[PDB]
Design a protein around this ligand. Structure first.
Ligand code: NI
Ligand SMILES: [S]
Length: 162
């Protein structure tokens, strides 16, 4: 099933996800529906918060083939270093891109789509992407990293579209 993706201004994008309790069949339907939604919208990552489910679930695909499935349930940043940043975009902030500061390298743990934990050391577009998506789970969007000015210009340009 494809899910609607919430757009700013929506208070539901500001909600703080509670952790996933038991990884099960029902949690697995959410996952595949998020993958379906993420590809359908040609996005490289998605957080349950954006589809208005408020649990700590994240699906990602940073491959250029669009065939490498990565799932982060209840993720937890253990280490990080450096700074990086690229032009980021967001399915929930339609057609707005800006550069945002990020840690270069991240090291997270999380449970996978079967409920089994894994540790992951990341850099490049994955590190940027893990950070961007975990921000969604705690009510934070990437435009928050910018002067109030650019933040108003961004909401204005998103009013019009929708
Ligand atoms: Ni986003
Ligand atoms: S996103």
């Amino acid at each position: 099933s494809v899910l609607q993706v919430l757009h700013i201004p929506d208070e539901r994008l500001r909600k703080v996800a509670k952790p996933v309790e038991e990884v099960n069949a029902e949690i697995q339907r959410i996952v595949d529906d998020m993958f379906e939604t993420m590809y359908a919208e040609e996005g490289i990552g998605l957080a349950a918060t954006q589809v208005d489910i408020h649990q700590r679930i994240i699906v990602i695909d940073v491959s250029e083939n669009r065939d490498e499935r990565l799932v982060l349930i209840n993720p937890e940043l253990l280490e990080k270093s450096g700074e990086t940043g690229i032009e980021e975009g967001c399915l929930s902030i339609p057609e707005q891109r800006a550069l945002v500061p990020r840690a270069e390298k991240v090291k997270i743990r999380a449970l996978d789509r079967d409920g089994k934990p894994f540790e992951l050391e990341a850099d490049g577009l994955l590190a940027i992407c893990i950070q961007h998506e975990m921000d969604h789970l705690v009510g934070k969007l990437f435009m928050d990293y910018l002067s109030p000015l650019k933040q108003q210009r961004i909401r204005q340009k998103v009013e019009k579209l929708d």
